[PDB]
Amino acid sequence: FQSMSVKGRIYSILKQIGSGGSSKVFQVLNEKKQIYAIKYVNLEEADNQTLDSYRNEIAYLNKLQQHSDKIIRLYDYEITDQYIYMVMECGNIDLNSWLKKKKSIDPWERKSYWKNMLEAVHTIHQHGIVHSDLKPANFLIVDGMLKLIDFGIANQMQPDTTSVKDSQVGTVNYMPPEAIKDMKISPKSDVWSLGCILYYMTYGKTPFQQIINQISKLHAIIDPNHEIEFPDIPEKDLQDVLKCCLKRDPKQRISIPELLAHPYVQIQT
Numbered sequence: 661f662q663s664m665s666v667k668g669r670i671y672s673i674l675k676q677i678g679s680g681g682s683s684k685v686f687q688v689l690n691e692k693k694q695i696y697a698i699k700y701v702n703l704e705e706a707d708n709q710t711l712d713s714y715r716n717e718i719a720y721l722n723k724l725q726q727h728s729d730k731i732i733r734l735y736d737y738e739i740t741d742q743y744i745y746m747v748m749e750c751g752n753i754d755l756n757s758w759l760k761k762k763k764s765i766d767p768w769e770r771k772s773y774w775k776n777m778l779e780a781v782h783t784i785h786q787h788g789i790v791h792s793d794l795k796p797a798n799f800l801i802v803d804g805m806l807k808l809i810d811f812g813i814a815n816q817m818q819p820d821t822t823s824v825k826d827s828q829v830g831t832v833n834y835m836p837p838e839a840i841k842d843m844k845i846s847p848k849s850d851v852w853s854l855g856c857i858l859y860y861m862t863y864g865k866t867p868f869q870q871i872i873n874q875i876s877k878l879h880a881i882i883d884p885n886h887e888i889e890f891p892d893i894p895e896k897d898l899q900d901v902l903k904c905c906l907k908r909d910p911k912q913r914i915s916i917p918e919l920l921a922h923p924y925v926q927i928q929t
């Protein structure tokens with residue numbers, strides 16, 4: 661029976677549907693009993709650089725409302741020295757929770773989801789944004805269509821140190837090799853991570869998921885003598901897409917515009 665205020669509008673909280681550190685997403689009702697998702701971000705421990713990164717992300721979310729329907733709808737927000745409340749569309753489910761529950765994926769739904777992701781990421785690239793942290797958790801299914809939730813500009817978030825909280829989070833399964841060699845990030849970096857998502861939607865695992873030692877996994881990702889397996893499948897076009905996305909040299913790696921003109925995305929059945 662809890663509520664919150666956003667720009668002098670009262671929302672009733674139904675349940676928590678997400679959490680990242682102390683940040684939370686609530687399923688809510690407005691006065692007209694219409695459903696929304698409110699994303700809460702805590703600014704209390706944020707320094708000026710972190711605060712600016714959140715402001716920048718909101719600015720882009722706002723601007724790109726016009727430029728694409730492959731980006732989550734933002735209806736309203738309140739920003740104060742203590743917090744950010746964002747009133748967003750309540751989607752069916754995030755892609756990661758969907759992939760967890762699904763035994764196998766329909767070839768036509770995989771193809772459609774792939775095209776949505778490419779279009780969403782191509783949009784942010786056209787505005788000079790490289791996400792650099794793409795995985796299934798960054799995409800929302802809305803009426804059988806995928807939308808990007810965030811742009812990856814903000815790198816920090818207050819940890820969860822109170823709820824009955826996990827330090828063992830943050831996979832490197834989708835991380836591209838050029839990011840590790842620099843330790844050179846470009847739009848090609850997002851192609852690799854998207855490649856890893858499609859590879860999971862095809863074979864039921866990410867390319868290096870079997871390597872449980874994180875140091876061994878990072879070595880394998882940059883090791884050209886570590887051959888990524890592409891088992892034979894009926895969809896030879898899909899096989900080809902995955903080999904093009906998962907080239908270790910970013911200069912040899914396929915671009916998103918080329919991917920959007922590939923037979924896999926363009927030719928159906």
Ligand SMILES: *CCC(=O)Nc1cc(N2CCN(C)CC2)ccc1Nc1ncc2c(n1)-n1ccc(C(=O)Nc3c(CC)cccc3CC)c1CC2
Binds near residue numbers: 683700748749798800
């Ligand atoms: C509208 C009905 C509803 O609740 N939808 C829904 C349900 C679920 N489920 C329910 C079933 N369980 C088993 C799995 C989870 C998930 C998601 C949604 N819909 C929805 N709609 C809008 C948003 C979100 N979900 N959502 C979830 C997580 C985020 C988000 O912003 N995540 C991040 C956080 C958390 C604050 C921090 C940092 C980065 C990210 C991006 C991944 C959102 C956005 C809005």
